Design a protein around this nucleic acid. Structure first.
Lengths: 251, 233, 121, 56
RNA sequence: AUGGGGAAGCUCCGUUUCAAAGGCCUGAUUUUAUGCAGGCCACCAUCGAAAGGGAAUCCGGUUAAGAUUCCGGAACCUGGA
RNA sequence: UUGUGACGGCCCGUGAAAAUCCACAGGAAGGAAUAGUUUUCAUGCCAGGUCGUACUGAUAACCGCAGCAGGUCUCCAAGGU
RNA sequence: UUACUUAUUCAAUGAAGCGGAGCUGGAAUUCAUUUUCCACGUUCUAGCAUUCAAGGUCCCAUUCGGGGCUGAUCCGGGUUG
């Protein structure tokens, strides 16, 4: 046969992301001294559109504690953050929307966003628009905070991991129909070359496991083993079940 | 006085630019510096078998000073003195046709690892000083055992550079006296008594004693805290 | 033995002493003579009808010039060869691959005078 | 043009006010007012904190 | 490219990474040199556009054939005590 | 027709850069009386190298075996209906 | 189901505050043998925060002004997780 499209997507030639219009990586302030012993006050200079990102970004300016310098950070804006607002990042920062408290400092039921997976990685979880993390609970000995992730997953992470308070701005985005191949085209034109999607069943057998036949049919089961290989993993990978499901997420 | 004010800068966690504190504890040291420090640290952390760590048992400063003073009195002859001696022997064999023995028998400290090891094997060596800084330890790690076998007093001393200065080099790694003058034979015997008291008779204990196994400052504090909260009942 | 105060946590390569070269022999042992001298940058005049009209009317000498020569060297070489003061030099590279210079002299000097001095009318 | 700014005189590129050629007049006024008022409030806050601690 | 790490190797990766990564002013500027407690420090090679960004020129005349380039007149920019 | 201006729609699309040039808080460095400050005000001095530049750009100057009804990017754009 | 870190492994930073140390006062189970945290001037404002730092302590052979301590605690040199 032939190397199939999902195989070709890994060589990263035409499938690299279109990063021209982007405003920089949206990362928290580095965990230096003030973020873990006190707080530091920065100012939201502007809230901007980042191409490919559904959530607005916040350009927050902080003072350098050791040098006469202004350090600009690129935050993921939460709902309600505005220009001219003061952001307080640190262990002693208050439970206000836009502040970057540690999970140990925030109490249970807190709505946090841009939560660090490990302390100091500058934000990994709940970064897409409208998304948030629930602080389920704490465990002070061997300090670990249990949190609920946007997918409903339980995660035990360090009590030192930072996170902004609130929900990510730009929510409700997927509630609007695109209505147009043109709108999909413009959506993906600045994300990556992943659109349009030809159906594998409409290809030839050289091009896909599903291609070929005198009728457009998959032929064999479309559920593929986790132990399958590249070129085989086309369909429903390691599916526990299939078909329409009668239920809700239930976290 | 009327024109001067009180500024004081508040160096709180978010108030004023921090002053130029000494950041020597946080320097990004070069790779070779880091390897030096970490090599020493790893050698300390690992349980070093008794064959090593019988070194780093160097004799104390006072007796080291006496021993190196005696050896410096027994120091070899410089190049200028060697040329003088050779010229005087040339003149002697020219005028009296002497049998090259007008010059007295020398009394010098024997150096060179192979030379000194052969001297110990032959039991010629009165006293042998073994440095502790030799980069491959296997060069001298067998020397205490050899000296114990041959009954020659040995002392692990501090400084291959010191031994090199002693024998007019940069590094000797070993020194030895095989013959002495009567004027300081008594001094050498007194020195040998204490050197043997430290090394030759405690040899079996030194060969049973295991070194190393020391943890870092934070680790010591951690086990201290754990023991304190365990026995605090 | 105490340490030194390291205000910055950055280690930089120390400024070690930089010696100056003191060679034990000369590299080429004889300095090459002037490659582009006045007789090398000024090859020969150009005596076309157009060039002679330039000499007669525009007070401009026309020359074939060394390809490696620039306007500075052309100016200097014309000055040193023909003892004239030149106003402007405009060069081009001809489609046959040679440098052609139009050297306009000052009002003090006559291009036709200097052309008759060189030898071509 | 930015390179044309180099040839002109200094009086064409600024205003006689403080922050002249960099900030607006209303910006400078707002910053003066804010600076004075916040520093006065800092003095008042320091005094009230000191006096409540002395009472305590 | 380098530092580094792969590969038997032709070479591959990597582009600031687990690297000790450099350049402008007066004092020094002659019984003594660019040596020196003289200062600021920390772009983090380079290549890549004759349609992107960009210092500055116009008119008249002139040739068989060149001209915003030559000539006449009138300007502008950049760099230099 | 072109340029400019104030505007108003559109986007789950909001239309990235860099060199370079100015400006802004600071007074670190100077003097008051035949001079001490100004080359960001006017006037005056000098220089500006290197390479391209002709012509066609197409039912004949390019590619298609050719002076081939093919292909090949762009600017200017009169009057009447 | 575990403990150690020093091999190996994963991240961050310009390797800046890590691990243990105390005046006056606080929570004040402490049977006068101190176990842990704060006042170590950061939260109404789109302001400012840089010149070995002002102030404070003993002296300089005086003309650019200073020097040590302190401001800014000590110990361990494991950058930190």
């Amino acid at each position: 046969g032939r190397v199939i499209r999902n195989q070709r997507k890994g060589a990263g030639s035409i499938f690299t992301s279109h990063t021209r219009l982007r405003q920089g990586a949206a990362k928290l302030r580095t965990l230096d001294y003030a973020e873990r012993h006190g707080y530091i006050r920065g100012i939201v200079k502007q809230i901007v559109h980042d191409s490919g990102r559904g959530a607005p970004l916040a350009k927050v300016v902080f003072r350098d504690p050791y040098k006469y310098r202004l350090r600009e950070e690129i935050f993921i804006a939460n709902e309600g953050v505005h220009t001219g607002q003061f952001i307080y990042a640190g262990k002693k920062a208050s439970l206000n929307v836009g502040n970057v408290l540690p999970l140990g400092s925030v109490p249970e039921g807190t709505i946090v966003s841009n939560v660090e997976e490990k302390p100091g990685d500058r934000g990994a979880l709940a970064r897409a628009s409208g998304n948030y993390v629930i602080i389920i609970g704490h465990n002070p000995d061997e300090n670990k905070t249990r949190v609920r992730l946007p997918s409903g997953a339980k995660k035990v992470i360090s009590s030192d991991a930072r996170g902004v308070i609130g929900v990510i701005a730009g929510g409700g985005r997927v509630d609007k129909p695109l209505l147009k191949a043109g709108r999909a085209f413009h959506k993906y034109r600045l994300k990556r070359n992943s659109w349009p999607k030809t159906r594998g069943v409409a290809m030839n057998p050289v091009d896909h496991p599903h291609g070929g036949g005198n009728h457009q049919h998959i032929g064999k089961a479309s559920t593929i083993s986790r132990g399958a290989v590249s070129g085989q993993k086309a369909g429903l990978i390691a599916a526990r079940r299939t078909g329409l499901l009668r239920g809700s997420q239930k976290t | 006085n009327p024109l001067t004010h009180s500024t004081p800068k508040n160096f709180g966690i978010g108030q004023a630019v921090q002053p130029k504190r000494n950041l020597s504890r946080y320097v990004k040291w070069p790779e070779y510096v880091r390897v030096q420090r970490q090599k020493k640290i790893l050698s300390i952390r690992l349980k070093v078998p008794p064959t090593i760590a019988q070194f780093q048992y160097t004799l104390d400063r006072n007796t080291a000073a006496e021993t190196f003073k005696l050896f410096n009195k027994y120091r070899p002859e410089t190049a200028a003195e060697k040329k003088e001696r050779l010229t005087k022997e040339a003149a002697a064999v020219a005028e009296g046709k002497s049998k090259q023995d007008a010059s007295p028998k020398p009394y010098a400290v024997k150096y060179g690892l192979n030379h000194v090891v052969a001297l110990i094997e032959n039991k010629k060596a009165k006293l042998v000083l073994i440095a502790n800084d030799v980069d491959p330890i296997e060069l001298v790690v067998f020397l205490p055992a050899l000296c114990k076998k041959m009954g020659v007093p040995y002392a692990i001393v501090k400084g291959k550079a010191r031994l090199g200065t002693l024998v007019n080099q940069k590094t000797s790694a070993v020194a030895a006296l095989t013959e002495v003058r009567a004027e300081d034979e008594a001094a050498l015997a007194k020195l040998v008594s204490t050197i043997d008291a430290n090394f030759a008779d405690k040899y079996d204990e030194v060969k049973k004693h295991w070194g190393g196994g020391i943890l870092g400052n934070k680790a010591q504090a951690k086990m201290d805290k754990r023991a304190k909260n365990s026995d605090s009942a | 033995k105490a340490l030194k105060v390291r205000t910055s946590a950055t280690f930089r390569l120390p400024k070690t002493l930089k010696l100056a070269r003191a060679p034990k022999y000369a590299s080429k042992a004889v300095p090459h003579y002037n490659r582009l001298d006045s007789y090398k940058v000024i090859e020969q005049p150009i005596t076309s009808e157009t060039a002679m009209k330039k000499v007669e009317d525009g007070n401009i000498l026309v020359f074939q010039v060394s390809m490696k020569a620039n306007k500075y060297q052309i100016k200097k070489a014309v000055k040193e060869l023909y003892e004239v003061d030149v106003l402007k030099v405009n060069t081009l590279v001809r489609p046959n691959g040679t440098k052609k210079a139009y050297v306009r002299l000052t009002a003090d000097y006559d291009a036709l005078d200097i052309a008759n001095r060189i030898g071509y009318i | 043009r930015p390179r044309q700014y180099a040839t002109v005189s200094k009086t064409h590129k600024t205003v006689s006010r403080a922050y002249g050629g960099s900030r607006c007049a209303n910006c400078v006024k707002e910053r003066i007012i804010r600076a004075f008022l916040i520093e006065e409030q800092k003095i008042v806050k320091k005094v009230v904190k000191e006096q409540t601690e002395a009472a305590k």
